[PDB]
Amino acid sequence: SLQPPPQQLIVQNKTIDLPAVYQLNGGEEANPHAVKVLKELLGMLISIGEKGDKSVRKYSRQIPDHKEGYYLSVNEKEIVLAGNDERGTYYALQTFAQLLKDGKLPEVEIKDYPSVRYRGVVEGFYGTPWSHQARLSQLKFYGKNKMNTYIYGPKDDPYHSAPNWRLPYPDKEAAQLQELVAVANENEVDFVWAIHPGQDIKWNKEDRDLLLAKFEKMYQLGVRSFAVFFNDISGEGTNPQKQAELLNYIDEKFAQVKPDINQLVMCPTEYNKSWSNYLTTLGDKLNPSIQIMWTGDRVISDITRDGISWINERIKRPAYIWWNFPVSDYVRDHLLLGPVYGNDTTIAKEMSGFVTNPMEHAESSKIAIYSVASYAWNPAKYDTWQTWKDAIRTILPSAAEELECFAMHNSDLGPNGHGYRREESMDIQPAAERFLKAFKEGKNYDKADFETLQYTFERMKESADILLMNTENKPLIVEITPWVHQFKLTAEMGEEVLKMVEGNESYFLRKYNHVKALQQQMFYIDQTSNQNPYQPGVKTATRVIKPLIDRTFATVVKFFNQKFNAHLDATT
Numbered sequence: 001s002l003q004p005p006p007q008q009l010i011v012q013n014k015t016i017d018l019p020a021v022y023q024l025n026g027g028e029e030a031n032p033h034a035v036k037v038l039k040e041l042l043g044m045l046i047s048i049g050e051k052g053d054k055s056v057r058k059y060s061r062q063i064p065d066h067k068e069g070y071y072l073s074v075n076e077k078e079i080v081l082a083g084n085d086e087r088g089t090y091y092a093l094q095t096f097a098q099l100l101k102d103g104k105l106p107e108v109e110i111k112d113y114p115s116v117r118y119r120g121v122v123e124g125f126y127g128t129p130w131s132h133q134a135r136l137s138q139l140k141f142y143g144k145n146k147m148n149t150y151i152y153g154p155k156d157d158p159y160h161s162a163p164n165w166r167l168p169y170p171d172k173e174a175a176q177l178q179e180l181v182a183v184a185n186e187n188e189v190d191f192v193w194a195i196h197p198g199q200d201i202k203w204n205k206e207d208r209d210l211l212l213a214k215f216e217k218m219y220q221l222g223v224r225s226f227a228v229f230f231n232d233i234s235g236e237g238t239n240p241q242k243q244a245e246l247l248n249y250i251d252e253k254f255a256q257v258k259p260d261i262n263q264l265v266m267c268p269t270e271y272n273k274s275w276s277n278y279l280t281t282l283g284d285k286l287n288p289s290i291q292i293m294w295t296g297d298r299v300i301s302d303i304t305r306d307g308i309s310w311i312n313e314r315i316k317r318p319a320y321i322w323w324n325f326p327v328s329d330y331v332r333d334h335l336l337l338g339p340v341y342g343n344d345t346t347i348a349k350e351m352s353g354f355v356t357n358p359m360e361h362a363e364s365s366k367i368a369i370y371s372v373a374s375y376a377w378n379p380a381k382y383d384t385w386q387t388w389k390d391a392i393r394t395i396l397p398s399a400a401e402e403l404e405c406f407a408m409h410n411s412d413l414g415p416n417g418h419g420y421r422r423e424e425s426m427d428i429q430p431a432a433e434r435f436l437k438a439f440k441e442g443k444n445y446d447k448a449d450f451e452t453l454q455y456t457f458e459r460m461k462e463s464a465d466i467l468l469m470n471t472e473n474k475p476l477i478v479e480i481t482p483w484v485h486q487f488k489l490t491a492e493m494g495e496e497v498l499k500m501v502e503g504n505e506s507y508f509l510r511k512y513n514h515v516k517a518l519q520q521q522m523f524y525i526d527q528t529s530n531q532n533p534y535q536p537g538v539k540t541a542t543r544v545i546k547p548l549i550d551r552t553f554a555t556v557v558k559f560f561n562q563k564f565n566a567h568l569d570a571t572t
């Protein structure tokens with residue numbers, strides 16, 4: 001199992017021992033970051049190097065001729081880790097580290113390279129920006145999954161957006177950015193520093209000079225890739241001719257002047273199909289090397305063949321995709337922990353880049369991020385479900401089943417202004433649907449369904465309790481804890497409500513009162529946890545499980561009230 005899966009893989013059904021004695025050719029000429037991964041993992045010859053190095057001369061026809069490509073070979077006689085370029089060598093090592101299992105390797109031959117040129121993450125959501133420690137952890141994770149791109153653009157950073165985009169970062173923060181940049185470098189990730197000036201930009205010399213001075217300060221802190229964001233603004237900063245002129249100016253006086261600038265990227269104001277001469281003005285005027293970002297047919301959407309042709313026709317270049325999932329900044333009471341799916345797997349050539357805007361919950365986003373990394377590297381082989389399982393097992397190996405259970409009932413967004421939904425709880429959804437119907441109509445429910453609902457609530461309780469106490473990824477557990485409490489409460493409510501379904505008039509009373517107490521505890525968590533100004537609270541298992549419970553409760557309470565002439569409160 002390899003994530004992302006390589007372009008080409010031939011496996012020989014033999015295994016070799018990681019050599020106790022070995023001879024390393026190329027250690028001094030190969031990418032230092034790749035050599036470092038190799039030595040920590042470690043007579044038999046091992047050859048490491050970039051094409052052009054004396055170490056790998058014998059394999060140069062083996063090395064794929066692609067940016068970031070690599071040839072990797074393991075057999076009983078030798079090991080070869082040969083990049084087409086320095087980052088390709090590092091990528092060989094990240095594949096190599098996954099082959100190693102118990103001091104053993106399979107005999108293989110891999111030729112690999114990314115299908116999409118830029119792959120990664122844009123921290124571009126509304127809400128609490130990622131902590132410094134969060135970001136350090138992200139960048140290690142990106143290099144492991146061959147994501148080469150991190151776009152730094154937290155809407156609420158005042159040195160990124162209006163009005164202090166004009167001011168150098170204060171010393172403390174600048175030292176932090178500088179560390180991020182060094183750590184990105186170590187993990188072969190391009191730190192792309194974004195600026196968001198359009199809300200108060202003046203199309204004059206004063207503001208244009210300030211923007212270049214700011215980019216120059218960022219250059220001094222090590223930054224080598226840059227973006228200019230014009231998303232979600234109003235006023236004169238939306239002018240497409242002015243924007244293109246600015247980006248072209250930046251390109252002419254900065255990106256073409258410095259020896260080593262990599263990505264120059266812009267996010268347009270009209271960044272999705274439903275929100276549109278703006279696009280053709282940019283496509284025609286903006287220098288061809290400059291990237292243009294795009295979220296799809298709507299603010300939140302998945303990328304289709306027709307959707308991507310539509311945009312590429314207007315911008316006159318392959319669109320650099322900003323995918324708004326798992327971003328939850330418009331449904332902040334939900335965690336979106338489901339599979340990444342819905343994106344067309346045959347359009348790699350029609351995109352310059354593919355990044356995912358994640359949740360404010362950094363560790364919880366690694367499930368989707370790991371999947372996006374898999375998809376963007378090798379879309380033709382992208383496997384939604386398997387990759388979601390591999391993500392979870394990679395992130396929490398000590399409690400993989402429990403995180404799966406929690407994530408599979410924490411996927412949908414609930415009703416929202418963007419109209420964007422995800423599947424959730426599909427496993428039990430038939431059994432749920434059948435159970436509910438047998439009440440609506442007044443018939444006997446199938447027993448197997450009752451038990452499947454029991455088993456589901458039980459596994460939910462187990463997973464909640466185990467996740468709470470897990471110490472392998474504490475930051476993850478801190479992020480999800482309030483939803484964990486609420487998820488456990490849901491499961492307990494579920495067990496008690498089913499017990500109410502199985503008839504004693506005094507037993508039913510105990511169980512009803514118990515359920516009233518559980519509802520109250522859930523109200524309390526919803527009223528005191530995650531109290532943001534927009535979608536306060538904590539909602540979990542909303543698509544299928546919570547309605548199933550609430551409906552079943554309202555039904556059985558009604559039957560009871562009709563039977564014993566009582567007036568129990570049937571609300572939820």
Ligand SMILES: CC1=[NH+][C@H]2[C@@H](O1)O[C@H](CO)[C@@H](O)[C@@H]2O
Nearest residue numbers: 124125126231271324327330
């Ligand atoms: C390009 C773009 N910018 C906005 C918009 O898409 O919607 C996102 C999700 O609500 C939000 O996070 C982002 O800041």
Ligand SMILES: [Ca+2]
Nearest residue numbers: 029030050053
């Ligand atoms: Ca070299």
